[PDB]
Amino acid sequence: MPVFHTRTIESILEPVAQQISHLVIMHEEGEVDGKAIPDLTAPVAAVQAAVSNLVRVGKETVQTTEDQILKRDMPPAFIKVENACTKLVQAAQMLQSDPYSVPARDYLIDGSRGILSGTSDLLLTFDEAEVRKIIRVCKGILEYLTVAEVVETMEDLVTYTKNLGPGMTKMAKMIDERQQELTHQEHRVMLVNSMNTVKELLPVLISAMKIFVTTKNSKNQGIEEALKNRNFTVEKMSAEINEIIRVLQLTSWDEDAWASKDTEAMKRALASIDSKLNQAKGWLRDPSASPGDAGEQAIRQILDEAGKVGELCAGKERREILGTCKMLGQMTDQVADLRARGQGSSPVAMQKAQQVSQGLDVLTAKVENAARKLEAMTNSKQSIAKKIDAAQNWLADPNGGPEGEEQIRGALAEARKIAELCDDPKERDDILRSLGEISALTSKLADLRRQGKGDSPEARALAKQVATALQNLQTKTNRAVANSRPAKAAVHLEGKIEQAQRWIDNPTVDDRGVGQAAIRGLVAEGHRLANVMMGPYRQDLLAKCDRVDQLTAQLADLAARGEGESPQARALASQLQDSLKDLKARMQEAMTQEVSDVFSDTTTPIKLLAVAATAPPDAPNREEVFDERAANFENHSGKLGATAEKAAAVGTANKSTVEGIQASVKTARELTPQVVSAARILLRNPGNQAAYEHFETMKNQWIDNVEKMTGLVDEAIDTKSLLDASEEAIKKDLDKCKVAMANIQPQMLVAGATSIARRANRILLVAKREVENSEDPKFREAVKAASDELSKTISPMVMDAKAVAGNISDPGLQKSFLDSGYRILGAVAKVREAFQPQEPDFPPPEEKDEEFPEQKAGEVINQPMMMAARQLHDEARKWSSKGNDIIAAAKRMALLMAEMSRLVRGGSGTKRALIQCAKDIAKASDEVTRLAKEVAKQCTDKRIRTNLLQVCERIPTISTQLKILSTVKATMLGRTNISDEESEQATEMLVHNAQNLMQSVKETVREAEAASIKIRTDAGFTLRWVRK
């Protein structure tokens, strides 16, 4: 199993794997061809100097090292390569004498693989050492955070403050440097996102603690939220640090990446069903409730959160939960319906309203039971993790104590819960099996630790045998958990529709449920959007949703039978594959509008909350009025979060923005009650300057993260669309204004002028951002001016809106208002213009690219890979390679991969034709990266160029491993005889890299043409983007 989680490792294995690559061409050039191997005293002498110094430096390290784990793990490593090279120096002797020596041309192949694996495994050792040091400093912070609560003093807090600060500073540094070194960007993300949070939390801890050694000392009505936050703030930070430690130990694709998000998302839905249960019941507990108020929604929210969880389950529970939701909701339809006749008191109108109310209880029970089963695995997985780590050290010292051996007992016991909790007897078995060997060897080495500790590597052959076996067990278990949760659909809009399509096409072929899952996700977002709208709108959306649900149900059932190519199995495919199209569009417009309103005003509620907290100890309705505000706040923060999540969902941006948005969203959810408490602290503890410094901190902290989210959501909307929606909204606001003056209600008037001013201000924000994001003189100036005009248009309307406050019926005042009004709307068209795409200007025989070869009649294909090539090719297949090198390289490697979807599985002559397929791809890999970097440079749009470059840095890394990997397979494909964990895993990794690669290429193609419209003054020319 090769490992290349870092830059150094790839840097050292790249060349090595290269030499061997050459020792193989010959070895196969003699094994199947004609004339055998030549003389290789120099080549095989090269492999020597390489691994030589390596092994050497390892030796100086092993000796001069305090680390027990390096002491034990390192040595076996050197040993590996020594034999691997002294088996090639030998193999070459017989090859120098009797070149045709067959028994010698096998000292090579099996000696060729040794050099690789041996070097990887040695290097791997240095790293784990490197990581341990970080991890140590990490646990420190964790532990020292424990201490936090045991602080009631002041000078005591001070000691803390200066003891933590540095260690924290040291951690951040170590971590920074570390990610700088990873080759898995994803891993680099989590590390930085985690370290960020932790940083920003620190101050919060401090502040709380002081606000603590203030009230708790006083003994009044404030500590109720003091020990709260202080304790909460800590439990969060120690969670991220744990996450960091977790991510650090990684050396390949995240296994259970979604493990956290899942158990945490199942927590929001529970808390959300919990916080709306009553409210939706109170509706069915009243035949006199309006078919659309809060109550009608609460039922709907509950059912949303319900399927959210349902979706995290598998088949049975998944379909049972979703099924329930369907009828429960469809039933509410019948209910609120009959209320639409006056027979809400019909015996049925209350006998279905209870039928549903009681169903809500069954459903809540079902989801809770599911949440539990999923968190049980989560805990177990975590338990196992800590235990194997505690027994890591007990294995390092030949002088352990039954305790450490009691950590290995616990590990297997926990691994036993994961087995029970399992539902595929095959996986559970493979687990329980291992426990028997591990349990043994751990006992067989325990004895020897009293019967002559065997401090001399004689026990090592066990203490290592075990540490390794434990490692294998933690992998089996991880899959069990992984394989327990269904495959997820793409996060972003585009990715879903794509996946949706695929299945639509081949409803027969295994996507692993992904296609129908993507459809479910979309419809779910459709319902989410709709359950927020009104009249026919909410019902019209819901119509097309139910419409797609019905179509997919049908198509899936046909295909299920056998009919995977029938007439309706197309007529349906068509009615559906066109149904999403209308939906995608319907939802995007839909979300743009929602964003206009929810995000209009974001600081008001927090203001009243801020105001309230300070209010005079004698203020009337004190303690009742505030509460009315804390509510009104938490409620709004929720709606913001909800909305931004829809923008993430159905908007336009990649995992780039989506993650950042979902990021701020979670946050908001955390600091919402925090703030809402620090606001209550100061209420029952006025004056107390520690109360202002704290609550101010929190609020402003929340007020930041918001604008961070406000900005991002706006970047999910297409600027042109945003401006448009903004212009209409301003127009209709001017209408509510006219109706106010017509009915004489200065409050109705003002509220519209107010909203208008907000609206126009937002426009200025979008503009400023749009301008900073550009390097193009024309644009920045055009937009700059228009936006300058707009501002002057703002205040005059506001004061004129104020004048007509009094004389709402007085003309000359409403004229001076409406006049300044249309003056805004005027300037807004002026800024809309500056965004207008540019008006086109004024300045063959054929093109014959090669088709896609797939027809191989049940030939030895590797499905997963063939897919990737196919998908990639399909994308490039849309354009012409004519005047487009990126397209060419794409199209080429597409086919250059299908040629690999053949060699991957053993064969005849492969081993060479493979080492070539990779090299060929990697050379193409190098052309895209190079051209994409250029298009990036000619781009005046900082965002795109920043995205373009983002997909580039990945290609190189990817193609490299693709080489190193292929070089390995070639080593163990020459013997198409038996199968083992080695050949199997390496083949597995190969596909994964070939997957990431075909993806990063579609991406580079997309962003490449995206940046195509933002290039100007025509320097080095462009790529000719034209569809065929």
From Swiss-Prot:
Repeat as UniProt keyword: yes
Q: Which residues carry this modification: Phosphotyrosine?
A: Y537, Y822
BP terms from Gene Ontology: adherens junction assembly; apical junction assembly; axon extension; cell adhesion; cell-matrix adhesion; epithelial cell-cell adhesion; lamellipodium assembly; maintenance of blood-brain barrier
MF-aspect GO terms: actin binding; alpha-catenin binding; beta-catenin binding; cadherin binding; dystroglycan binding; molecular adaptor activity; structural molecule activity; ubiquitin protein ligase binding
Provide the alphabetized UniProt keywords. Acetylation, Actin-binding, Cardiomyopathy, Cell adhesion, Cell junction, Cell membrane, Cell projection, Cytoplasm, Cytoskeleton, Disease variant, Lipoprotein, Membrane, Palmitate, Phosphoprotein, Repeat
Q: How does it assemble?
A: Exhibits self-association properties. Part of a complex composed of THSD1, PTK2/FAK1, TLN1 and VCL. Interacts with APBB1IP and NRAP. Interacts with TLN1. Interacts with CTNNB1 and this interaction is necessary for its localization to the cell-cell junctions and for its function in regulating cell surface expression of E-cadherin. Interacts with SYNM. Interacts with SORBS1. Interacts with CTNNA1. Binds to ACTN4; this interaction triggers conformational changes. Interacts with FLII. (Microbial infection) Interacts via its globular head domain with the central portion of S.flexneri IcsA (also called VirG).
Q: Which disease is it linked to?
A: Cardiomyopathy, dilated, 1W: A disorder characterized by ventricular dilation and impaired systolic function, resulting in congestive heart failure and arrhythmia. Patients are at risk of premature death. Cardiomyopathy, familial hypertrophic, 15: A hereditary heart disorder characterized by ventricular hypertrophy, which is usually asymmetric and often involves the interventricular septum. The symptoms include dyspnea, syncope, collapse, palpitations, and chest pain. They can be readily provoked by exercise. The disorder has inter- and intrafamilial variability ranging from benign to malignant forms with high risk of cardiac failure and sudden cardiac death.
Q: What protein am I looking at?
A: Vinculin
**Organism whose genome encodes this protein:** Homo sapiens
- Gene from which this protein is expressed: VCL
